Amino acid sequence: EEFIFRSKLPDIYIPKNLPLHSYVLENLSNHSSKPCLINGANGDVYTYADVELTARRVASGLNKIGIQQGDVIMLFLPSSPEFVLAFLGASHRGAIITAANPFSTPAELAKHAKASRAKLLITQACYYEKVKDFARESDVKVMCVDSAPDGCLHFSELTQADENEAPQVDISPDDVVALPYSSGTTGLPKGVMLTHKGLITSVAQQVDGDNPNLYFHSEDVILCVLPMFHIYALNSIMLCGLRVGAPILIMPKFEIGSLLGLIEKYKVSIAPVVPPVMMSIAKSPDLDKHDLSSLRMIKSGGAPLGKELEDTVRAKFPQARLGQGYGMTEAGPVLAMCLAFAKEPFDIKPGACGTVVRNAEMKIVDPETGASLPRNQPGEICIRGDQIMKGYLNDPEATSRTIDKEGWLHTGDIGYIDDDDELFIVDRLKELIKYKGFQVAPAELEALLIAHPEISDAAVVGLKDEDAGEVPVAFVVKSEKSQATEDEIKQYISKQVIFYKRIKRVFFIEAIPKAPSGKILRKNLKEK
């Protein structure tokens, strides 16, 4: 704690005795009849007044079917109005929301539902069969938003419930409200506990204050094509958008053609994106078949854009201001944010990662010594503030090695801050693999591979890739006499995992390089 970095923006007032829903919808009356949630795929619309009232009904409904304060509700849905209504609804009830990609496999879903100890599952009928077995066998209530196969509940039982019967709840600021899963700096997916105070803090750091880090014009329309089941989109787009009363145009499924049409149609002006989608948008031959002049800002994150794409986007969307931010689930998840988006913008440099958010502290430590480093000195990025997670669910050791004794969250990312307080990420210490912006845990794939009868050891590492950034490859030690082939192993994994967790190549070896403790020498592997 010698060299401590902060935002170039002054600290602001942040409520510390308010529940998340009360905070994000605090200034509802100024725009109560204004559009809040718009479903770009079917035109559904919910005004601000509609969301506030329905949230309370969802709370009454949840109670009615037995969901109590502290209970975990699992969402198995695509980005949508229903997702937000279920979330805000759970927040009003004092319940917790955990979410998973609807494209997950039954095994992945059951594991998630089991670990999170979800009492209720909300999804769509086209995904019902993937939870059908697990459901009955675990006495977990299943609910669908469209049809209601078998005996599962319908979502109108929550949205149409009597608000007057919404239970009386005393939400404490330190009560958990969001439970996203993340592998963190090492190992298997773990439950990240995010509190009311934590999230309110994070939203405030991004959009509150006389000179907000992210400024909104009254005519702005923010796009939500990023997945709501990932906290980054639910926070930076939905919660932040609601907080400032902006209309949010949601896209359940990404399709270049429709998106461009939607941008002209609804006058989309703020486009939150990740490198992969931005790259798809940039390669579109139909950019001139649509009026995209309403676009004034391309907000990127999740992974680096790269100098080339950065230049490409800047060239193909001269009407918009391009900027990049940086987040990590356990951090709330926003750590740094592009100050070129502030009401009174600051200059930013190419490749920049943004500036550490206000009402927070950031330092850079020598991964070895642990000493704090000064400007322009690469090291591990650490952040501290009320916005970071409370810890991992039922996993004290994990928490203890991610958040140190002085409250600093260790990201496992290597970067440095320059004289202009702009953060630059240059390397990654943790084993985390990111394919298409999605997180892929080597330990998870490794466990699946090793469970195979003909495999005695395995290691999964990231292989640099143009289209996805990193593709997972696997080094495998076959058991004696095994004649299993690469394709046979790859299909073995593919059947059990969601699309982005497929291993692209299998390299057979006689032994996985390991340190005395058993830690895989991953750089030793990558070095190959």
Ligand SMILES: Nc1ncnc2c1ncn2[C@@H]1O[C@H](COP(=O)(O)O)[C@@H](O)[C@H]1O
């Ligand atoms: N702008 C960025 N540049 C480079 N890496 C990033 C960026 N944003 C996120 N990441 C990486 O993604 C991790 C966050 O993953 P997650 O917890 O799945 O959102 C960070 O710890 C980084 O390793």
